[PDB]
Amino acid sequence: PEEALIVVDMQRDFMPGGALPVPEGDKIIPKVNEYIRKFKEKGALIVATRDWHPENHISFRERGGPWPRHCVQNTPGAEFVVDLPEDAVIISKATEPDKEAYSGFEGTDLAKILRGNGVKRVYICGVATEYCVRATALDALKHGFEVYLLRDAVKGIKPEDEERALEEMKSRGIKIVQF
């Protein structure tokens, strides 16, 4: 397809009641699910990125890292909270105990898969705006994709930071849309 939808880290631990919740993150699930249905209908590639951490990951507080344990491989916290079609491409990131990966491109084959499927433009949604959404969007820009941010299908943790990240992405050429 020429376009792809990239759904970033829509997992149980990043939703309210999870180990690392994005405030009101569950509120965007109907709209993310709607975009998935829409892109599926447009015959677009659908990609879902997930944090897929081993126990004792370097980013966790048990290793002096910044975050509580979250999105551990083969646990309920790592499960998707969105409805994905059978032909969704699943990208698992940060799987090695001593390597972190914020962007869905970092340490993965995402660029290669996108190009292999003839993708030219990518639509980004998911959580959190100022963290893995931002990083993924900026990395897609690096690789030469036209990048869109789905305004009504992202959520971040702090309003001031979400604010800064959106302004930043726009300035670097990422287009903010909804439909």
71 is catalytic: no
- Taking the least distance from each CB to Zn ion, the nearer of 20 and 114 is 20
How far is the C-alpha of 113 from the C-alpha of 46, rounded, in Å?
A: 11
CB 71 within 8 A of CB 50: yes
**Any idea what the Cα angle at residue 174 is, between residues 107 and 18, rounded to 5°?**
55
Q: What is the DSSP secondary-structure string of 18-87? A: SSSPPTTGGGGHHHHHHHHHHHHHTT-EEEEEEE-BPTT-TTBGGGT-SB-S-SBTTSGGGSB-S---TT
Q: How far is the CB of 96 from Zn ion (least distance, A)?
A: 12
- Taking the least distance from each CB to Zn ion, the nearer of 9 and 162 is 9
Identify which range of 30-38, 48-56, 141-149, 167-175 contacts Zn ion by CB under 5 A. 48-56
Indicate which residue of 9, 13, 71, 125 is catalytic.
9
- Taking the least distance from each CB to Zn ion, the nearer of 45 and 138 is 138
Q: How far is the CB of 94 from Zn ion (least distance, A)?
A: 6
Is 139 annotated to bind a ligand? Reply is no
Identify which range of 32-40, 50-58, 104-112, 145-153 contacts Zn ion by CB under 5 A. 50-58
Is 57 annotated to bind a ligand? Reply is no
Question: Residues binding Zn ion: what is the number (CB under 5 A)?
Answer: 1
Is 143 annotated to bind a ligand? Reply is no
Q: How far is the CB of 150 from Zn ion (least distance, A)?
A: 22
**Any idea what the Cα angle at residue 39 is, between residues 119 and 88, rounded to 5°?**
75
Q: How far is the CB of 30 from Zn ion (least distance, A)?
A: 25
117-140 as b/e: b if 16+ CB within 10 A = eebebbbbbbbbbbbbbbbbbbbb
Is residue 51 part of the contact set for Zn ion (CB under 5 A)?
yes
Q: Determine the 3-state secondary structure of 127 from DSSP.
A: strand
132 is catalytic: yes
**Any idea what the Cα angle at residue 125 is, between residues 29 and 42, rounded to 5°?**
90
Residues of each annotated binding site:
51, 53, 70
Residues of each annotated binding site for Zn(2+):
51, 53, 70
Which residues are near Zn ion by CB under 5 A? 51
Active site members: 9, 132
